Design an enzyme around this catalytic site. Structure first.
Site, PDB file in Angstrom:
ATOM      1  N   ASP A 348       0.831  -1.192   0.000  1.00  0.00           N
ATOM      2  CA  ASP A 348       0.000   0.000   0.000  1.00  0.00           C
ATOM      3  C   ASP A 348       0.872   1.251   0.000  1.00  0.00           C
ATOM      4  O   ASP A 348       2.048   1.228   0.376  1.00  0.00           O
ATOM      5  CB  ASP A 348      -0.931   0.009   1.211  1.00  0.00           C
ATOM      6  CG  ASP A 348      -1.944  -1.119   1.173  1.00  0.00           C
ATOM      7  OD1 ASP A 348      -1.503  -2.285   1.168  1.00  0.00           O
ATOM      8  OD2 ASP A 348      -3.169  -0.850   1.154  1.00  0.00           O
ATOM      9  N   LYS A 459     -18.362   8.384  -0.242  1.00  0.00           N
ATOM     10  CA  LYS A 459     -17.050   8.840  -0.691  1.00  0.00           C
ATOM     11  C   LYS A 459     -16.829  10.307  -0.334  1.00  0.00           C
ATOM     12  O   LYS A 459     -16.063  11.011  -1.000  1.00  0.00           O
ATOM     13  CB  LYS A 459     -16.838   8.615  -2.193  1.00  0.00           C
ATOM     14  CG  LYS A 459     -16.566   7.177  -2.579  1.00  0.00           C
ATOM     15  CD  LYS A 459     -15.574   7.136  -3.722  1.00  0.00           C
ATOM     16  CE  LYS A 459     -14.304   7.902  -3.364  1.00  0.00           C
ATOM     17  NZ  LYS A 459     -13.522   7.218  -2.295  1.00  0.00           N
ATOM     18  N   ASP A 689      -3.659  -3.515   6.814  1.00  0.00           N
ATOM     19  CA  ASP A 689      -3.773  -2.883   8.126  1.00  0.00           C
ATOM     20  C   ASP A 689      -5.202  -2.778   8.648  1.00  0.00           C
ATOM     21  O   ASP A 689      -5.404  -2.748   9.866  1.00  0.00           O
ATOM     22  CB  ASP A 689      -3.165  -1.484   8.109  1.00  0.00           C
ATOM     23  CG  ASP A 689      -3.867  -0.554   7.142  1.00  0.00           C
ATOM     24  OD1 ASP A 689      -4.422  -1.046   6.132  1.00  0.00           O
ATOM     25  OD2 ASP A 689      -3.856   0.669   7.393  1.00  0.00           O
ATOM     26  N   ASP A 693      -9.157  -5.794   4.716  1.00  0.00           N
ATOM     27  CA  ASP A 693      -8.054  -6.430   4.003  1.00  0.00           C
ATOM     28  C   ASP A 693      -8.001  -7.919   4.265  1.00  0.00           C
ATOM     29  O   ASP A 693      -7.460  -8.658   3.438  1.00  0.00           O
ATOM     30  CB  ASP A 693      -6.733  -5.793   4.421  1.00  0.00           C
ATOM     31  CG  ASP A 693      -6.689  -4.309   4.121  1.00  0.00           C
ATOM     32  OD1 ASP A 693      -7.354  -3.533   4.842  1.00  0.00           O
ATOM     33  OD2 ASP A 693      -5.991  -3.920   3.164  1.00  0.00           O
TER      34      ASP A 693
END
Ligand SMILES: *[C@@H]1O[C@H](CO)[C@@H](O[C@@H]2O[C@H](CO)[C@@H](O[C@@H]3O[C@H](CO[C@H]4O[C@H](CO[C@H]5O[C@H](CO)[C@@H](O)[C@H](O)[C@@H]5O)[C@@H](O)[C@H](O)[C@@H]4O)[C@@H](O)[C@H](O[C@H]4O[C@H](CO)[C@@H](O)[C@H](O)[C@@H]4O)[C@@H]3O)[C@H](O)[C@H]2NC(C)=O)[C@H](O)[C@H]1NC(C)=O
Ligand SMILES: *[C@@H]1O[C@H](CO)[C@@H](O[C@@H]2O[C@H](CO)[C@@H](O[C@@H]3O[C@H](CO[C@H]4O[C@H](CO)[C@@H](O)[C@H](O)[C@@H]4O)[C@@H](O)[C@H](O[C@H]4O[C@H](CO)[C@@H](O)[C@H](O)[C@@H]4O)[C@@H]3O)[C@H](O)[C@H]2NC(C)=O)[C@H](O)[C@H]1NC(C)=O
Ligand SMILES: CCCCCCCC/C=C\CCCCCCCC(=O)OC[C@H](COP(=O)(O)OCC[N+](C)(C)C)OC(=O)CCCCCCC/C=C\CCCCCCCC
Ligand SMILES: CCCCCCCCCCCCCCCCCC(=O)OC[C@H](COP(=O)([O-])OCC[N+](C)(C)C)OC(=O)CCCCCCCCCCCCCCCCC
Ligand SMILES: CCCCCCCCCCCCCCCCCC(=O)OC[C@H](COP(=O)([O-])OCC[N+](C)(C)C)OC(=O)CCCCCCCCCCCCCCCCC
Ligand SMILES: CCCCCCCCCCCCCCCCCC(=O)OC[C@H](COP(=O)([O-])OCC[N+](C)(C)C)OC(=O)CCCCCCCCCCCCCCCCC
Ligand SMILES: CC(C)CCC[C@@H](C)[C@H]1CC[C@H]2[C@@H]3CC=C4C[C@@H](O)CC[C@]4(C)[C@H]3CC[C@]12C
Ligand SMILES: CC(C)CCC[C@@H](C)[C@H]1CC[C@H]2[C@@H]3CC=C4C[C@@H](O)CC[C@]4(C)[C@H]3CC[C@]12C
Ligand SMILES: CC(C)CCC[C@@H](C)[C@H]1CC[C@H]2[C@@H]3CC=C4C[C@@H](O)CC[C@]4(C)[C@H]3CC[C@]12C
Ligand SMILES: [Mn+2]
Ligand SMILES: [Mn+2]
Ligand SMILES: [Mn+2]
Lengths: 995, 35, 291
Positions: A348, A459, A689, A693
């Protein structure tokens, strides 16, 4: 395993029915401050640590005995028993017998004791160091005691403690929810369904599982935050009774050890076959029944590398410790070998490549670019702080913010204090506090009615505030988010105070500014607000958050704010080494494609020369659709395109591209990328993290979770934990992973070399019929007595200079024990060692009276105990023991020659690619072994009484130097072979001897 | 007596060497400043 | 069958033909150079030792006493009445005695006659080829009393009177020195000839000393031992047909059908003994004439 939905639904009895007062009086805990540290320690010492009862541990006198009477030691035990029995049989026969068979048995017993003790010492070191990882980084629990919230050890949590968990937190123990705000827990490990169930303090169901005011052990908080009170700890937890007796691990197979086991079984089968064939051969040769078992034991010992498993364990534990000391905690022992095979690293941008320390540097308002955040010298900014548009920008940048400063921070500056919130929100707070004023007052005047947090669906952020002014329509809507998306949601812009319609020219200028700030490697954020008309929304109007009623579009765009997040220090070097080692690195971020592209190009993801389709189009002034897709070696895949793509397009992009960067990609899409990468036949390592994920971390070959900013879900869903979240640590781990393979192969090439020189004497003794040049007692002292330390010293060797300049290894084809390894240990070095030993043997026999040519066929009378008139080359007559002393002296000389050639073999084995002069002798354990084996051989040869105990006699000086030329020959041959491999890569020498 | 090789001389030399090498190896494995 | 052979690339047992030949030629030049270097080192080593004297002799010192015929476990048991139970012993005795007949010692250049009685040692000089071959002190089988293979081929085995000829281990450059009369107080009574290395047979236990019988020692000049005139030995390079001195012992008036272990021990300054090697200086023979 009928241990779920049956052994759980009935064993259930809680206090969820108790109220706040009843719960407080029952558990005795300050609902607003938590128990006092004294009471906490009292309960810890009363109920015990918050952990499950561990499995029984075998005592120290159990492993020692089980090793003393192990598998291989059993053959020597039976040999010693047979020797003692034969001594008793001889004691009953002829009076005044000899103690040969008794001494042989005592020697075998002493050898067994020493072998068992050394094996137990190494096994104890391995088990003790392995245990050191279980206490490396213990899991923490955030509890509240004496009013203050502190992070303590998970095992230090007691019943009644005020525990607080948030999104990504692991439930420390069964809790009773006291306060909660939109908390969602996952009971997949409890009820089976992965659907997140909300948790609320209100009593909703009488069943403990279905209620909403109880968090069970082992579950994890997916979204939100909550505060509970421990109701059960340790084994008393609901899930504890099941996890202690029905969740034990199975028989996980480790390929690194399985391959050695297979090779060990094959070598053991061939060794036992040769041992039995020689046993019958000796029996047929008119030999004692005990001598046949002696020859068999010797052959098996010299042909079975019985310490291979120990060497594998030592190498694995040592490299695991190395990775641990370099910020790479391996959760399991299997990942330690998958690291060396890593070929694709999907890291990332924010959190791993960069330090996530953002700083407001540039802004865009009034159609102009402004630099700001003076070096805290009260210089202010490069513009006037009285700009009207700047006021509307700071207002929405401070009101829409959700982060606040903590206490005890008004005595140090704003650029070095502590905050509580997003890194972007922290940078904005430190900015408006360094050039505007105090946010505690601005956020107080503009009271916030309803706020919409950052959601992947929206968003954007949102905040409705009542304005205390007089010329405004009492309603001010403020929202920030993606600059591109914030721009599409507005129809007007503020210019020096006057609002004007957003035309195409203003949008084009905004795009130019966005490309300018994005090419600088900065994350840009869009801001806007709207003064909703008062006629439609009166003072008493109530804005509904669940049912959006207020206008969401046609707002007023105010300005852009960008912050700088510099990359880590060793990141450019890390990606350089990765490119130099054939490891494909992919950047997976949610930032804008311009910023992601610029950051990737700067950190080295996209090296000079490589261009994407867009770059080629802009260079040749042609539409991107006209450009050839294959003409770009690198690409910047947008999130929207990844969503509307098929497995075919994914394989196309991931196949014909050397530098890929996925921008604006939601964390959930990582799973698809990992699957596509694995679809290309590559061992993938993925960094994670957050909680979303987890699918990507579990699906990938090597899941790397952030140890600092990463949540418990990522840590438990990954295979390795990055202690510093530094990308360079992944490369370091990959290097150590390749180091284990290198050192394991170098160690195997050395332990197996000693086979030919130790077993050839018997073959020549039987084919050439010459006196036995090497005895069984000597073979035992060599294998089980001297090469025990050198065999392990090869594990502590360091890495070569080409460890990071070679292509990754695929486990499907590259194995430890290959044909080229055998061709080296058994065909070239072994032959030289055997010739050296034979040379010293011929030298001793020729110097004592028996010429080398005359020795052929004398073995028949040599072993005859009654033909005490053996005629030597000079015509002299020898007795039985007189010549046997010379044969034993030859055995000792052969042993010394073996140690001599072992020096050169160990030295040349320190490296398989570079020259011994480039690597150096930095291995202290190797030198220690070099000194210890020579000293041990010297002692076994010169110690008084050994002539009648171990049948080893003193060696004359002019003999210790007989095997030196063979040692130097081995050294020069290995150095010239490595030199040819260095000067001619991929050559026949490399494809034939490079193991 | 041209039939007796002084074995005590070689034995003592070998024992002295074994002790020297053992002390050196002990110092290397238990190194205080050899890092 | 795939690993055994594949026709795609002509791979046999795992590798193709081109690689097969490449490794065969490489291994031939390699093993050839290794064996060549081995032979070279062997020759360089041979160029260090001498051809008429070994570089080390402490391993054969003192010499070991041996008996003829060589019998397993040093046990000599046979039926005197049986004409074949003693055929092996007589066969092995003759196989060695034929080398001492008057026919083998015919040439006068190689075989020279030495004193019929114990005399001083015949030191030939230096261990070189300056004088070529060396003469050999002749030894007639007649020096052995009744067991010589001249009058009685059975050597006494036919009438229960065995004759176990004793022999001294041949050692190059060894000068035997018999014990001096000054220290003669421990070894048994025997003829004291300062020019003969004596040997005396005794029993082993209290029963053996009683059941042995009467020892009859036969040697050159009637002395129980080896004449000093037959030493030193110069090896097979200088004295190829060298004949070592001999002496036999006859066991008459022995207990029939009883195992008896006798030990013949050689005395002298340079003759030692050993606890582990029961054949260094002395030897033990077990006999039983089961008629
Ligand atoms: C091992 O070698 C020795 C070498 O000396 C052999 O020794 C012989 O042992 C026999 C057996 O004991 C003795 O015989 C005794 O002879 C006594 C008297 O003999 C006299 O005359 C002899 C000469 O005449 C004989 O010898 C020549 C050759 O030398 C012949 O050619 C000739 O034909 C004769 O045969 C003298 O040499 C001797 O010194 C005497 O002057 C007898 O008294 C005696 O008999 C007694 O013992 C018998 C056995 O118990 C018993 O039955 C009788 O009743 C009587 O009591 C015995 O026969 C030899 O004297 C002796 N020397 C020689 C030179 O022969 C020995 O034989 C040999 N071992 C074997 C197994 O062959
Ligand atoms: C050297 O070797 C000879 C031969 O072995 C020994 O002498 C004896 O020889 C005779 C052969 O004729 C052996 O055979 C016979 O043994 C029988 C067993 O009796 C024994 O026990 C009694 C005890 O009451 C003794 O008194 C007796 O002597 C025997 O020892 C006897 O019954 C036989 O008698 C014949 O001999 C005797 C004595 O010689 C005559 O008076 C008789 O008339 C009759 O002819 C006969 O003895 C005998 O075993 C041999 N004795 C042994 C082996 O001890 C010599 O003894 C031996 N030399 C030495 C020093 O031991
Ligand atoms: C966990 C720990 C690991 C340790 C590893 C190291 C292992 C070390 C092994 C043995 C240590 C030996 C200790 C000292 C021994 C000497 C004792 C002694 O003072 O003895 C002196 C006398 C010498 O007599 P002399 O000189 O007059 O000779 C005249 C004899 N003539 C005339 C026949 C030639 O000797 C005698 O009498 C009696 C001789 C006794 C010799 C004992 C040696 C050991 C015997 C059995 C144990 C086997 C252990 C093998 C281990 C191998 C591991 C690879
Ligand atoms: C009477 C005489 C008897 C002589 C007996 C001689 C026995 C010699 C053997 C000694 C020990 C050998 C141990 C081998 C252990 C192999 C372990 C292993 O897994 O190897 C895998 C390796 C293979 O590794 P791999 O299986 O991991 O990789 C395979 C790779 N592909 C698929 C491409 C092939 O085995 C080999 O490479 C082959 C080794 C062959 C060794 C053949 C030795 C023959 C001995 C001939 C002696 C002739 C004497 C003539 C005397 C004449 C006198 C006049
Ligand atoms: C009483 C007896 C006491 C005996 C003590 C025995 C100790 C034995 C332990 C090791 C010795 C045997 C292995 C030596 C291996 C040397 C390997 C090597 O090249 O190291 C290079 C290395 C090279 O590394 P470097 O660090 O020096 O160089 C690095 C260079 N850069 C930085 C550019 C990469 O150095 C050493 O190991 C230092 C010590 C060398 C010791 C060499 C001893 C032998 C010398 C010549 C060979 C023998 C000649 C005999 C001639 C006889 C004539 C009659
Ligand atoms: C008349 C001459 C008689 C000579 C008698 C023998 C004398 C001793 C022989 C060698 C001892 C000295 C060795 C120096 C070796 C190189 C040291 C070095 O660091 O160079 C760095 C260079 C490497 O440099 P580099 O650039 O890769 O590493 C440095 C990297 N930086 C700059 C970042 C630090 O070494 C080599 O490339 C070594 C190539 C060796 C090829 C050997 C081929 C023959 C095989 C063995 C040779 C002989 C060994 C001794 C045999 C003795 C027999 C008695
Ligand atoms: C001294 C004499 C009697 C022994 C000669 C041994 C020969 C016949 C044996 C010993 C070890 C063997 C080699 C062992 C391993 C390999 C590797 C393989 O991929 C090709 C065959 C090859 C190269 C073998 C060829 C045959 C070989 C060289
Ligand atoms: C520098 C490297 C290659 C050489 C290794 C060191 C060599 C020279 C060392 C290793 C062990 C040593 C031997 C150890 C013991 C003895 C016994 C003594 O009574 C005579 C010397 C002698 C025989 C030593 C000679 C030197 C020696 C052979
Ligand atoms: C430049 C290089 C090739 C020189 C190689 C020299 C070789 C031939 C030398 C070096 C060491 C030597 C050996 C050293 C010690 C002994 C012991 C001695 O009692 C007999 C000879 C013998 C066995 C030597 C034989 C020849 C030898 C092997
Ligand atoms: Mn994340
Ligand atoms: Mn995994
Ligand atoms: Mn070995």
């Amino acid at each position: 395993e009928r241990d779920m939905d049956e052994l759980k639904k009935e064993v259930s009895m809680d206090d969820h029915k108790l109220s706040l007062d009843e719960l407080h009086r029952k558990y005795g805990t300050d609902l607003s401050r938590g128990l006092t540290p004294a009471r906490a320690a009292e309960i810890l010492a009363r109920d015990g640590p918050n952990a499950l009862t561990p499995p029984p541990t075998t005592p120290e006198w159990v492993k020692f005995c089980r090793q003393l009477f192990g598998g291989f030691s059993m053959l020597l035990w039976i040999g010693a028993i047979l020797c003692f029995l034969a001594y008793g049989i001889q004691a009953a026969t002829e009076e005044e017998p000899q103690n040969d068979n008794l001494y042989l048995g005592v020697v075998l017993s002493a050898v067994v004791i020493i072998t068992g003790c050394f094996s137990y010492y190494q096994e104890a070191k391995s088990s003790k160091i392995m245990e050191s990882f279980k206490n490396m980084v213990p899991q923490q629990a955030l509890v509240i005691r004496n009013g203050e919230k502190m992070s303590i050890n998970a095992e230090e949590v007691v019943v009644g403690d005020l525990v607080e968990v948030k999104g990504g937190d692991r439930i420390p123990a069964d809790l009773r929810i006291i306060s909660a705000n939109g908390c969602k827990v996952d009971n997949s490990s409890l009820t089976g369904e992965s659907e997140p169930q909300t948790r609320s303090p209100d009593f909703t169901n009488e069943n403990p599982l279905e209620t909403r005011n109880i968090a069970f052990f082992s579950t994890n908080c997916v979204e939100g935050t909550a505060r509970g009170i421990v109701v059960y700890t340790g084994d008393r937890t609901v899930m504890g009774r099941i996890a202690t007796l029905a969740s034990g691990l199975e028989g996980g197979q480790t390929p690194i050890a399985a391959e050695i086991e297979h090779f060990i079984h094959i070598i053991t089968g061939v060794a036992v076959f040769l041992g039995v064939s020689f046993f019958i051969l000796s029996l047929i040769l008119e030999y004692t029944w005990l001598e046949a078992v002696i020859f068999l034991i010797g052959i098996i010992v010299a042909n079975v590398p019985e310490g291979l498993l120990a060497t594998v364990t030592v190498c694995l534990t040592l490299t695991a410790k190395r990775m641990a000391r370099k910020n790479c905690l391996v959760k399991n022992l299997e990942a330690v070998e998958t690291l060396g095979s890593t070929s694709t690293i999907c890291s990332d941008k924010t959190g791993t490549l960069t330090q996530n320390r953002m700083t407001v540097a540039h802004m865009w308002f009034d159609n102009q670019i402004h630099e700001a955040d003076t070096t805290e010298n009260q210089s202010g900014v490069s513009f006037d702080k009285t700009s009207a548009t700047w006021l509307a920008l700071s207002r929405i940048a401070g009101l829409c913010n959700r982060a606040v400063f903590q206490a005890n921070q008004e005595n140090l500056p704003i650029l070095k204090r502590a905050v509580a919130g997003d890194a972007s929100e922290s940078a904005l707070l430190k900015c408006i506090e360094l050039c505007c004023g105090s946010v505690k007052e601005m956020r107080e005047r503009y009271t916030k009615i309803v706020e919409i947090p950052f959601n992947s669906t929206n968003k954007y952020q949102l905040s409705i505030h009542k304005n205390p002014n007089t010329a405004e329509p009492r309603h001010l809507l403020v929202m920030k988010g993606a600059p591109e998306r914030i721009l599409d949601r507005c129809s007007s812009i503020l210019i020096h105070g006057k609002e004007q319609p957003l035309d195409e020219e203003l949008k084009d200028a905004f795009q130019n500014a966005y490309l300018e700030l994005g090419g600088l490697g900065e994350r840009v954020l869009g801001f806007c607000h709207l003064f909703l008309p008062d006629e439609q929304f009166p003072e008493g109007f109530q804005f509904d958050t669940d049912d959006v009623n207020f206008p969401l579009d046609n707002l007023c765009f105010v300005g852009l704010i960008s912050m700088i997040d510099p990359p880590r220090a060793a990141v450019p070097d890390a990606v350089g080494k990765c490119r130099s080692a054939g490891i494909k690195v992919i950047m997976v971020t949610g930032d804008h494609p311009i910023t992601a592209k610029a950051i990737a190009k700067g950190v080295g993801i996209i090296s000079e020369g490589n261009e994407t389709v867009e770059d080629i189009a802009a260079r040749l002034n042609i539409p991107v659709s006209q450009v050839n897709p294959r003409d770009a070696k690198a690409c910047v895949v947008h999130g929207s395109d990844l969503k509307d793509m098929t497995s075919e397009q994914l394989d196309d992009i991931l196949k014909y591209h050397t530098e890929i960067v996925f921008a604006r990609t939601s964390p959930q899409q990582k799973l698809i990328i990992v699957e596509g990468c694995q679809r290309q036949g590559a061992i993938v390592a993925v960094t994670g993290d957050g909680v979303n994920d987890s699918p990507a971390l579990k699906k990938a070959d090597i899941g790397v979770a952030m140890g600092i900013a990463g949540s418990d879900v990522s840590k438990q869903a990954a295979d390795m934990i990055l202690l510093d979240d530094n990308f360079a640590s992944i490369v370091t781990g990959v290097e150590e992973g390749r180091l284990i393979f290198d050192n394991l192969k170098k160690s195997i090439a050395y332990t197996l070399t000693s086979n030919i020189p130790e077993i050839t004497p018997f073959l020549i003794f039987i084919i050439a019929n010459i006196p036995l040049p090497l005895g069984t007692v000597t073979i035992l002292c060599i294998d089980l007595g001297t090469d025990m330390v050198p065999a392990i010293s090869l594990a502590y060797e360091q890495a070569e200079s080409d460890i990071m300049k070679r292509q990754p290894r695929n486990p499907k084809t590259d194995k430890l024990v290959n044909e080229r390894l055998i061709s080296m240990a058994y065909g070239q070095i072994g032959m030289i060692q055997a010739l050296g030993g034979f040379f010293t043997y011929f030298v001793i026999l020729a110097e004592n009276g028996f010429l080398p040519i005359h020795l052929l066929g004398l073995r028949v009378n040599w072993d005859d105990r009654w033909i005490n008139d053996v005629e030597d080359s000079y015509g002299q007559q020898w007795t039985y023991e007189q010549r046997k002393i010379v044969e034993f002296t030859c055995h000792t000389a052969f042993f010394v020659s073996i140690v001599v050639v072992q020096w050169a073999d160990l030295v040349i084995c320190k490296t398989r690619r570079n020259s011994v002069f480039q690597q150096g002798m930095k291995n202290k354990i190797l030198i220690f072994g070099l000194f210890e084996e020579t000293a041990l051989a010297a002692f076994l040869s010169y110690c008084p009484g050994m002539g009648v105990a171990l049948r080893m006699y003193p060696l004359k000086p002019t003999w210790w130097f007989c095997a030196f030329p063979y040692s130097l020959l081995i050294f020069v041959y290995d150095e010239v072979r490595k030199l040819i491999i260095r000067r001619r890569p991929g050559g026949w020498v490399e494809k034939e001897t490079y193991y | 007596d041209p039939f007796y090789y002084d074995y005590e001389t070689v034995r003592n030399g070998g024992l002295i060497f074994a002790a020297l090498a053992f002390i050196v190896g002990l110092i290397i494995i238990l190194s205080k400043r050899l890092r | 069958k795939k690993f055994i052979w594949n026709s795609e690339k002509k791979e046999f047992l795992g590798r193709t033909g081109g690689s097969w030949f490449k490794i065969l030629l490489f291994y031939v030049i390699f093993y050839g150079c290794l064996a060549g270097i081995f032979i070279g080192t062997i020759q360089v080593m041979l160029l260090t030792i001498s051809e008429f004297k070994p570089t080390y002799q402490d391993r054969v010192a003192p010499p070991g006493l041996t008996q003829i015929p060589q019998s397993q476990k040093t046990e000599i048991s046979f039926r005197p009445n049986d004409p074949q139970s003693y055929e092996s012993y007589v066969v092995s005795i003759v196989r060695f005695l034929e080398k001492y007949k008057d026919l083998a010692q015919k040439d006068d250049m190689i075989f020279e006659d030495c004193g019929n009685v114990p005399s001083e040692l015949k030191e030939r000089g230096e261990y070189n080829n300056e004088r070529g071959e060396r003469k050999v002190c002749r030894f007639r089988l007649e020096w052995l009393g009744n067991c010589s293979g001249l009058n009685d081929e059975t050597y006494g085995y036919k009438d229960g009177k065995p004759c176990v000829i004793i022999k001294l281990n041949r050692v190059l450059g060894f000068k035997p020195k018999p014990p001096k009369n000054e220290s003669l107080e421990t070894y048994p009574v025997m003829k004291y000839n300062p020019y003969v290395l004596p040997v005396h047979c005794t029993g082993k236990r209290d029963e053996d000393k009683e059941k042995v019988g009467t020892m009859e020692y036969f040697g050159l000049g009637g002395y129980p031992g080896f004449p000093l005139q037959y030493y030193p030995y110069y090896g097979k390079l200088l004295q190829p047909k060298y004949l070592q001195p001999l002496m036999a012992v006859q066991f008459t008036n022995l207990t029939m059908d009883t195992e008896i272990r006798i030990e013949c021990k050689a005395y002298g300054e340079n003759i030692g003994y050993s606890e582990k090697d029961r054949f260094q200086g002395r030897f033990d023979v077990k006999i039983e004439v089961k008629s």
